Every structure is written in structure tokens, then in C-alpha cells.
Design a protein around this ligand. Sequence first.
Ligand SMILES: CC(=O)N[C@H]1[C@H]([C@H](O)[C@H](O)CO)O[C@@](O[C@@H]2[C@@H](O)[C@H](n3cc(CO)nn3)O[C@H](CO)[C@@H]2O)(C(=O)O)C[C@@H]1O
Length: 182
Amino acid sequence: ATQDLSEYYNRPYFDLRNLSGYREGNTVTFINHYQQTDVKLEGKDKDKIKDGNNENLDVFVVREGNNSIGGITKTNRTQHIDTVQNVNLLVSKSTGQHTTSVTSTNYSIYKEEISLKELDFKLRKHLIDKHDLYKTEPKDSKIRVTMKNGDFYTFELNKKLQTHRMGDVIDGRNIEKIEVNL
Ligand SMILES: CC(=O)N[C@H]1[C@H]([C@H](O)[C@H](O)CO)O[C@@](O[C@@H]2[C@@H](O)[C@H](n3cc(CO)nn3)O[C@H](CO)[C@@H]2O)(C(=O)O)C[C@@H]1O
């Protein structure tokens, strides 16, 4: 399962921007000058995308198992050459009963609207790359994303993000900080 988790979060992802998605049923189809991708609506995403053509979407694609789940957002209304938000990321690791660390960095946000799919996947890749995630059993460790209004979103690192959450989106301007406890 840990193996499975690392295989999943090590997969490539594709960050598509400002294109059309065509909803037929519970599937949104995207076409690139490179790939056709079919994206499943499994959650509250089902309630916002219109049947037929939807313009000016972005989508965060991870091939499952060219099928991906969720990760669809409104594209940015304006070009933001500067970032949308700077977010303190705070990782805490206990390399034993004797030693604890905190890494404290800046996570830039470039999207007005971002999916949980994107946060979950990117943070986990980060954590794999720089903090040995999934070299050990994850147990109880969680990412937590906290907003300015105190609302929060939890990602449990012992399982994949729940498919019904992949299409949930938040306002990237209102993310306050991100905290992880390995
Ligand atoms: C609503 C809000 O502002 N935050 C709220 C979040 C948030 O609604 C969801 O993350 C959106 O996807 O949910 C919290 O709880 C989740 C559970 O919602 C989620 N869940 C439950 C089930 C089955 O009943 N399937 N998924 O499970 C996770 C942990 O894996 C969380 O508990 C959250 O993310 O923290 C509560 C939070 O206040």
C-alpha cells in the first residue's frame, strides 16, 4: 500500500490551462495539440460543470490506475506574472523520540481557483522528494491546509485523496498556511 501510494504520487502530472472541456454524462473530455484526456466527475464537481462545452477551464491531470479524476478549475481571469498568494509551508518530522525538525518555506500559489487534487498531489510529491515520504509507513501523518477564515482541508497520507474530493476547489488567494506532520 505504501509502495502503491508512492507509485501513484510519483506519476507525472499535467497542468493544462485555459482550454475547453466538453461534458457528456459524468465525463469531461479535453483535447490538446498532444492528447485527448477524459476526466471523471465523481463529487460535487458533478453539480457545477454544464453539460456540453465549458470554456476557459484549467485541469490538473493524473492518469489513473487517458483517464483522470477531478482537478478541474476556472482558469485565471487575469494573467498573474506575479504570484496570487504566498503561503507558509511547515513540515515537521520526528526522526526519533530524541529529535524533531521543522522546515519552514514559501509555497507560491499561481491559481485563483485551485483543486484539492492539485494541492494534494503536488505537496505529496514535494514530501517524497525532500522529506522521504513513503520511505517509511506513513501511519497517522496528514497534510492540513488552513484558510484565512479558519476553514481547513485535511489530506491523510496513509491513503490516496478520496476521489469525490479531487474536484473540490478553493480560493487560492485565501489559503493561509499549509502544515504537515511526518
Ligand atoms: C468544509 C470545510 O471547509 N472543511 C472540511 C473538509 C472539506 O469539507 C473537505 O475536505 C472537502 O473535500 O472536510 C474535512 O473532513 C474530511 C472528510 O470530509 C473527508 N471525508 C469523509 C468521508 C466519508 O464520510 N470521505 N471523505 O475525510 C477527510 C480525512 O481523510 C477529512 O476528515 C477535512 O478535510 O478536514 C473537515 C473540514 O472541516
